[PDB]
Amino acid sequence: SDAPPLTLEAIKDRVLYVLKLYDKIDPEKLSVNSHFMKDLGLDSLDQVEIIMAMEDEFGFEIPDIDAEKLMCPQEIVDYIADKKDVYE
């Protein structure tokens, strides 16, 4: 049929996967609750690039006003889960 019913663990796995290929982010130091500015020491442009990478990966656009607020991978996972009605 069509694409499978995306689940929460898959979303989190993809988010951490795409974040671990970023050269400015340490893989070991990166956690699902890590803060981009505080814990990882990135600026706003790096956040914009990360959000653009998420848009490219999952194939849907995140509005700017909603995009600025995301700061940790858990926030991105929650936003994507709420957007696509993923509940399991």
């Binding site: 796995d13 993809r14 996967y17 795409v18 671990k20 290929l21 970023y22 050269d23 400015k24 893989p27 690039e49 990478a53």
Partner: protein
């Protein structure tokens, strides 16, 4: 069904045009931190692809072999 993502450390910009991009940016003092993300588009089974002329001549070998054997049959069938 029930398939997990591959390892993330196998993706390397080495051997792909991303290496040339990084070398060009290194001469300018800059860097490309997203090459490893794009390495999968060149790494595996997508490593090579045909050209336009080569794409047009997809089944030319088999077709020409069939044409040659058919022509040979025709030449040595009118001899009746």
């Amino acid at each position: 069904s029930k398939m997990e993502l591959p390892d993330y450390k196998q993706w390397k910009i080495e051997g792909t045009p991303l290496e040339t991009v990084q070398e060009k940016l290194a001469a300018r003092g800059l860097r490309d931190p997203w090459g490893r993300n794009e390495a999968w588009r060149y790494s595996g089974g997508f490593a090579n692809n045909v050209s336009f002329v080569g794409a047009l001549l997809k089944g030319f070998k088999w077709g020409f072999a069939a044409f040659v054997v058919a022509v040979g049959a025709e030449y040595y069938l009118e001899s009746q």
